[PDB]
Design a protein around this nucleic acid. Sequence first.
RNA 1: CUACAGUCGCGAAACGUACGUCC
RNA 2: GGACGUACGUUUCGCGACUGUAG
Lengths: 647, 618, 178, 178
Amino acid sequence: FKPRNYQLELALPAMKGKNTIICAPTGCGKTFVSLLICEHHLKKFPQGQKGKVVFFANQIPVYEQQKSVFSKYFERHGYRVTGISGATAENVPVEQIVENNDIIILTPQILVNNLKKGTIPSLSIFTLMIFDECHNTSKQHPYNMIMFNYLDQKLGGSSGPLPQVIGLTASVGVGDAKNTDEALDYICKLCASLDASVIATVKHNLEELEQVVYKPQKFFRKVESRISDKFKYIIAQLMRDTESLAKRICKDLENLSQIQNREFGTQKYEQWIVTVQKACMVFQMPDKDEESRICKALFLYTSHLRKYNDALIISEHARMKDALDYLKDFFSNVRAAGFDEIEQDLTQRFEEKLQELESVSRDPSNENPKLEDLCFILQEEYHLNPETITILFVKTRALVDALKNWIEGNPKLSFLKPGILTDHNILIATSVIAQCNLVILYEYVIKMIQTRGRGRARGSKCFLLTSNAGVIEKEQINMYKEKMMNDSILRLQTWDEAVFREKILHIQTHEKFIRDSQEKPKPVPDKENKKLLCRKCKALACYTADVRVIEECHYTVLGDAFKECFVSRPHPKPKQFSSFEKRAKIFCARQNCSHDWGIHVKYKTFEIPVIKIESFVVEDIATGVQTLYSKWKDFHFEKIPFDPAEM
Amino acid sequence: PFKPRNYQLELALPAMKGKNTIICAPTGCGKTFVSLLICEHHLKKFPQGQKGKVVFFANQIPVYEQQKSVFSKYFERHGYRVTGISGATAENVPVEQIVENNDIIILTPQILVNNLKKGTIPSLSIFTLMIFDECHNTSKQHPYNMIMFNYLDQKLGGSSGPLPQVIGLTASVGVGDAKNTDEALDYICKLCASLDASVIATVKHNLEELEQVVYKPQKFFRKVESRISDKFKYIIAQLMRDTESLAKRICKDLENLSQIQNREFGTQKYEQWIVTVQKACMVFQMPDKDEESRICKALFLYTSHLRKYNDALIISEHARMKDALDYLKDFFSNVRAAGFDEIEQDLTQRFEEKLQELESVSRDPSNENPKLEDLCFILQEEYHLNPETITILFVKTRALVDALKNWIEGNPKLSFLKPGILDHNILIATSVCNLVILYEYVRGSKCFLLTSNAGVIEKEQINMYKEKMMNDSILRLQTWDEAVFREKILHIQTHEKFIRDSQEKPKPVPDKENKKLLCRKCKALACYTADVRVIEECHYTVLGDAFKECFVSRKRAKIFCARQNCSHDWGIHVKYKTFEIPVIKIESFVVEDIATGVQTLYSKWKDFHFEKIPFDPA
Amino acid sequence: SRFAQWAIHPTFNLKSLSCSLEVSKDSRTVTVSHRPQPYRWSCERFSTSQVLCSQALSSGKHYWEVDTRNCSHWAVGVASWEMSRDQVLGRTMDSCCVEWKGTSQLSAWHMKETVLGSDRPGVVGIWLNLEEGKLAFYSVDNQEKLLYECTISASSPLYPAFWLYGLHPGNYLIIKQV
Amino acid sequence: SRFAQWAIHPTFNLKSLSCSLEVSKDSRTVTVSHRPQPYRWSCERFSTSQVLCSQALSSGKHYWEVDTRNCSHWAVGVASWEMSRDQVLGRTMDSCCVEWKGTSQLSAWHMKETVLGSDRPGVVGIWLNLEEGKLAFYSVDNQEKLLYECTISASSPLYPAFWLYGLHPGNYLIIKQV
RNA sequence: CUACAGUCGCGAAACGUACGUCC
RNA sequence: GGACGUACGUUUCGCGACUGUAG
Ligand SMILES: [Zn+2]
Ligand SMILES: [Zn+2]
């Protein structure tokens, strides 16, 4: 309602009519500065002329919040404020929206899809474009796919009235730079890819910015691992048992990978397990019914190796008990799934040592010391001041509910209430609101910028716990990259505007030529009909002549013999994307395959099995060799479109 | 906590007095406690307000990460900021900002040479204590010597502020290529001048307490002789004489193209001979552009087969005949599928006529490798005396390592062993316990030395004499006065700096003449030196549309020469930031100059000179 | 040293001292370490910043004095040995204390939330008459300025507990003369 | 030599001599040198440090005594004759032999680390009864104690054997008269 | 100056898994 | 189903530089 001085020191280069990279660290500051520029842009036109400012928003809550702000402010002047989402772009024409409105707040994938389609044939129909959180305009992102269509209009020499392309950020980003001049190269490349010339920052009003900045202090706390890892020993014995059982049906197992010595409980072991499991899907033994048992047994053994390898990591990060609970839940799932002579053997192998594992998990002396001082630093500052709200950033989804369980049952931590947001003292989240003056990064490495509300700063703490000093040194140099970002901004602000718009033209033209030389056409579609097998049973699913393409992205199978090879199951989270509605989630109709093949969807009137090539194996019937193509665009074949007149 | 012993107090006692020293502590992870003692004393001794900054130059990434873990576990409890920089960490965080916020830095030394080259670190005065690891490798051009070049060039001349205290941590100062105590004294004084050091302190008082720790073993020399009934060498020598007669029939100048006159089968002399005639055969400018191709292709095939025969003889002289047989057979199969020629069909037919004879004679347990079976005898006698010992058997060449593992699998008597390549009984590792057997390598522990040539035992006795000479030389120098020693090393350093600053202008001339590039084997035109582009001064490629029709592609794609039977791999398809241009190797070319008539050879892209035009997408 | 000498100064004990504190070789200067150190694990480690003393009870002669200046936030009082080590100083059933809260306020805890003014002692001493459970917190020289009285259930010895804010390395307290 | 003699001393064969031994023409006196002696390599040459004898077998009359002084590591015993020449003595399931290890204990094999007491036997004499099943080894003067027990599978040739780690040059084993 | 093993540094590329977003 | 981004880990390739051994 009433502007301030730093919100007008930022909006002043934008009102002159030149493109800007306004970088304000206030959450409500960006909304009010965009409001001021959007207000001044419309009221400068002569009679009959209209402004058609479009404000992009990348996320859904940001889109709806900016729609609620931009409509409840621009109602008294009679400006038509609408917004499009993916939940609104269906059954509503896009072209009659843009001609009938002024302050459209669409999300950018709609505009990229319509620019591919043909409606809104040029970006000259707007007169201003605002990019919210503009530092994602880097490579193949939907801001950059719009700026491609803008720059191929400006640099082509066929230009019309191009709009102002201002952009609102909070941190311009340094990326992969080391010294100051590489940071200057990166910020100049960003300003060239976003086509601006001036970078505005609060300079005269640093008092009005320091009172609302949300600047906490850091308290790095390196903590060690445990010394008597009995659990790692027992699961290591079980993994050696499963590995030795896996070699009796594949004697050449150690030839299937180019990795060095593999240790249990790292990510390298999961890389080795994934490589082995992909290498064991392409066997072509001439029995063709024992192969349906050999590849199934290999898939089962590698799945159990992967589950033990995940339980090791969950035990080394979280409490010890959640590893055994995760393993028991997976074994309950496989008990409810089915049973053969392999799975009965593996379950009765785990039951032999379940009691030893359950007794060694319940020791009062074998906590993680990382958790042991997490409870200490949670019981210090709460005891100092019992009105302190905290938030606990955890890396994985599997550890965001381990620690939810952990405070549920702690005698020292009875005064917390877990507030998982993947009457709440703590909020155990994975990825993020400027009300909590304690942030604890539980082994979590652009910094987590909590500058969001129309509030204050008032002092917070940013404790960082870890077990390896790489986590510490990454933040120790993140602070210095933030130290050189401000200096690169300040050095770039002292150039001349006649030479800067020429300096970015070099980068724009050079990148246009680099982008245009990589417009190589499609490879030759190999004509011959191949067929697809499952990745667990290797039974015949279909041939590649029954494959139809829905919208040049999705794939279905049209045959009638495919109708008896899958069994449906209702989807756990049904939603609607772009023409669709997730109905079911199909599985293989063998005795004990039950492999995740795809999704059963409702497209216009029909129910069709949208499949994915990621869980299949493509086989040529001419030679007999099998291959694994892991994305649909890499499996090159004769792509026939979908036709509703057939069925 | 671990315990400080007395000799590890005596070793660190002189360096803590403020002298640049060279400890000569023996192995056994002892020096990695002496270094900890000196760091703990050195960081303590600065008064409040100022600070010290220790820098520990490692040399290998295992040793670097090992010492980083040790310094982390030892110094983090007391309130210091230990860190580590390497090549393993990516291009991040300018090093003058890591070293402004830490107190114990573990560099590998090429990082400091790099940061002193471009001036992102100002000078060596930022540190206060430099600790070398294995300081006896400070030598002609080693990176420790580049760091000490900067240190001495800062000391003498343009006098700067305070310089760091220098400490070296060798285990054997290594007096090699000396003869008597005089040359050992001059070499050790030269090294201690190259570190700007003054004390070569080692333990003297409780030397018997060191003797409680280190066990110098007693040796076992094994002079064992060669075979006699060399039907393998007879057939192979007949084949080699046959191929030499064919090459002499074609060339008729082969005996004067080389300069190694007396040629013996199965040694490095014949290898130098065949390499020199290979380098001499390609360089022929003649007015017959088909006959140069024919002669050079025939000589390439003949000389490569001769070189493979000579290396098969050398391999078979040190390992089983089966190993050389599978080597020869997979070589012949890999060249038979490479390209068909009547020369190649001739040579493969001539070998496979004798192949079954070689398999019949070779797979005979009466014709056993004597050195190998004496090794087996020693293995069984020691392992039956003690079934708990381990062997870390050192071999010269990796092919012999894998062949010896193939033998220890193909020995039914030695079922009780597990080989290892570099939970285990025997390790087979080349040029990195209770038995340190050296298969011809020039508490209850013995070391053997098996040889087929008498005189490397003479080299070992010369080595023992050198070791006694080194101990006598350091014991002679250690009783000197200090000031005459510091004057002596000052004049040695001034003389070496004076030699350093008078000849260092190796500035070449970029040549403007256009040239051509021929194939090394078939001698066909590939491209011109006016056509190649070099991308980021490290990725020499050919931008040329006529070049695109003169290779055949077959990791990624590796290209080959497009002739009818050439099969010569020039380079490799690589992907750049966007493009997929192929890079080439000059080691598979012959440079010819289009002005003159020379056909000069080169070995690497830095030596071959031209005007280097950078690559551009336009 | 001002009124009559009634007790001898306490000493922090190395078996029930919590795992984050680093009392020195004189055993009377308590401070917070940089990094927490490995100690023994039994039923006596408090896993907080709470430490006890070894001064047994008497009839009525107890008065002790420690230097509490240059500690960020502290809490001083008395507690019984028959107490769970996971508990908090001043929030148990019977352990009376006085807290220096985060709001720069000197409050007190007894089994409730009674509070003094905005005073902050550089020096405060606790008077004890162990036969009847009385306390007087005479700070420094200001006509015996106590400002709080507590009833203590003398059914156990009275090893006085001290808690400090443990997130500041270098933060300390010192036992001084009475 | 105090009761009646039954048999005579064995003699060694030159057909299965060790490759590093120098047994002379008296054929009861072995001697080791440094360099291994070049012989013909066949399936009868032992190529290890085991030494056999040349006596033909009988029912129950067997006696001989060997001087085991001046030797560091030795192992003397009587076992089966028909075995592979690539195998060594003591690893077979039928071998009555004593393996005096370098770890200073008088061990022996029955295939099974059958370790015995800690004597240092001066003069070992192998007394064999294949007919009567009584094995006796009277070392030195100690009331004729056998100090070792064997059960035998008397259905095979039972040639007497020797085995000694000869890498100390000048080591010798000699048979004297009883 | 030829082969042989051992090492470091600088740049370019691909892959796996996890997390978040959007259609 | 698909597309994008981020983090961690692994592999590949090219170009240099250095030391030692034997000829
Ligand atoms: Zn299936
Ligand atoms: Zn060629």
